[PDB]
DNA sequence: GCTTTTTTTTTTCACAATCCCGGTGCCGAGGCCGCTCAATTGGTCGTAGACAGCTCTAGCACCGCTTAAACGCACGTACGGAATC
């Protein structure tokens, strides 16, 4: 078999069908969506790495994630992102 | 037994996969157990937000599946997404219909 | 190894094609002196982008420039490109 | 004999190409030009086809957008014809060029 | 009654300031701006002295740089006098405002 | 008047002096306000990030580093304050 | 000492520690921080040699930010490396657009 | 007491006395030299970090540094920069 | 204030270009399958960092002098830009 090449494509479909059920996605489109998630992974994870480093901290926490999102995302985009991480962590925490 | 972290967080995006990539990515020595949840949260939000707008431009173009051009129109016509993807080039994307005023006929 | 040395392919970037790119940029009227000037610019873009890709190749010891070589090179020039991996 | 006024077809071309996304440089001429330039830096190199396509996507975009900057620069000096000096200002303010 | 013609002190003032390195904005007014603007993001903030000077080096630097690019646009429109539309163009081309 | 729009504290004389050091000769009247606009957006952007740093570090005192780190993010890297 | 072994003033020890710690890679070769010290040392020297000239050309014994700015902005290559960098108290290079000068 | 904050200054001074043994240096100037060294150290290590990362390698070696330097410094400066990093390693290897 | 033209506006068809549909056909989006290797479970151990307590740094407030800089106003020259060619 060809060597295993991971992607976010199954997650992208799963999200797409939540938003626009009647809607599909071309090979190339999905590849752009992939560049996008990797792009923003690198940026958020990078500014997290920094925040921790700056504060003489060995650990990226969800705190560092949040703050980096405040630095990296424009206005209303950042807010919804801050709420939706804050939801998800809370839900995860009570579920243990 | 066996329930994925992504399910416990109400998430489609993989917390398992994310919490690895942080550790292996030379980002820091340690990783808190919320960090990859939070991050998967944000990547799912942002991903959803682009497919919400892409798909409207998909529908408005009278087609069922999203292609580069739909994404581009959706990114460039949306004030904040365009700022976030300001130094980013979308292949087979093209440009927004824009013709400067003074270039038009009298 | 079965013939590969290259010609003068910068004139391959024809006046028709430069005119079409200017058109996409919403340019209505184009001076005589644009086309040569454009090729200079284009050349200097490509020289810079390929030098860097070619580096990323030579490091991984390959003799084949990958799309990722070009991608990694483009992000380096602050020209991040979506839809060819990474 | 019918004849369209100078600018009326340029304006059509402008709308034709803004609507579209296909690449505007002839794919082989461009490919030959990639290979020619790359020799400078290393000989007997192979390129993935995707690497060459990734280069023509990144090029066309860079110029198409420079031509926007350049058009404003023409119009800023109450002109409609983009001139060499227009590009050069665009590039000097971008900082691509001393 | 000695009277220098328009622009002839300008040039003195250019030569003068280009030779020098000293902040050109008055330090206290600047500082009062930095606190006014800081409030809109957090109340009862204190600043290190050097934080304000780091902010003021950075500001003037940007402004000076923007003026160079502005001058260039104004000269590009066969003019000698900078105007807002020069600033706005140089910012449009810097990718600072859409 | 003389009241709590500290931006106006940025005098015409000081705006003139910048554009001098920037090789400007003849300065339109409208410009001193345009400049004032532009300066604020500049500080807003930098200071928002610098204080975002401050709040993360759990402090009430904005450090010169916080600014340095902000200016790096804005692509305006500054030497000689802790780089 | 290591720096002494490598021909260097810059501390091959210190540099090596900043790499392991500084979240760059899991492991750090024994070459890297030697090489890295050498390059930092090289670049340091070129600026100082050029800025120390700018001081003496202004009859001054101590190098100041202006001397660095002048050294750096006049050297096609150093300018490009530090093209998006601001030197506090550097000032700018005397230069007046031609069409502004009289006649 | 008073913190204990490290800096490249004692080395900036040592190099200065190699290139100009009678010229001195201000604290603001030495602050720019310390800003300069830290800047490029982070530039070269980050580009090495990524090189290594793109080639599935765990070790930054002197080779990663030398590829990062071709990438970051302009032609004529990269040339001397390699020439000096090569020579320093050779000399170090040679000793023990 | 006219008489006589140019300038600008209007209306009438001719023609090209683009637009929109259904028909047709090919191929890649979508999805199912079977197997894998990476995410999960449940455990252990060590230390990173939260936390309370104390030190003393440097940020802030205030005040009272001495200017240097900002200010406002008079005046006119060189500039921006409109108009023509
Ligand atoms: Ca919906
Ligand atoms: Ca189907
Ligand atoms: Cl966490
Ligand atoms: Cl090594
Ligand atoms: K890192």
Author numbering:
A (entry chain N), H (entry chain R): 30 to 125
B (entry chain M): 13 to 118
C (entry chain P): 17 to 102
D (entry chain O), E (entry chain K): 38 to 135
F (entry chain L): 20 to 102
G (entry chain Q): 16 to 118
Quote the paper:
The eukaryotic genome is packaged into chromatin by an approximately equal mass of histone proteins, which provide a foundation for modulating gene expression, maintaining genomic stability and regulating DNA transactions in general. Histone octamers composed of H2A, H2B, H3 and H4 core histones assemble variable expanses of ∼160–240 DNA base pairs (bp) into nucleosomes, the repeating units of chromatin. Here we show that nucleosomal constructs with cohesive-ended DNA can be designed that assemble into different types of circular configurations or continuous fibers extending throughout crystals. By introducing DNA annealing as a site-specific and directional driving force, cohesive-ended nucleosomes can promote self-assembly into well-ordered lattices with a variety of possible configurations.
The prototype mono-nucleosome (first generation, a) design entailed a palindromic 169 ‘bp’ [four nucleotides–165 bp–four nucleotides] DNA fragment (169a). The 169a DNA contains a near maximal (consensus) histone octamer-affinity, 145 bp Widom-based sequence (601L) and histone octamer-‘repelling’ 10 bp poly-A|T elements in the linker DNA sections, which terminate in single-stranded 3′ TGCA overhangs. The 169a was designed to uphold the offset particle pairing (the two DNA termini of a given particle each pair up with a different particle) displayed by the NCP lattice. However, due to the angle of exit from the nucleosome core, the linker DNA termini intersect one another, which fosters dimerization of two nucleosomes to form pairs, wherein the self-complementary, 4-nucleotide overhangs from each of the linker DNA termini associate with (canonical) Watson–Crick base pairing. This results in a circular (figure eight) double helix of 338 bp (with two backbone nicks offset by 4 bp at each junction) encompassing the nucleosome dimer, which also corresponds to the asymmetric unit of the crystal. By co-crystallizing nucleosome assembled with the 169a DNA and different linker histone variants, we obtained near-atomic resolution X-ray diffraction data sets (presented here and unpublished data).
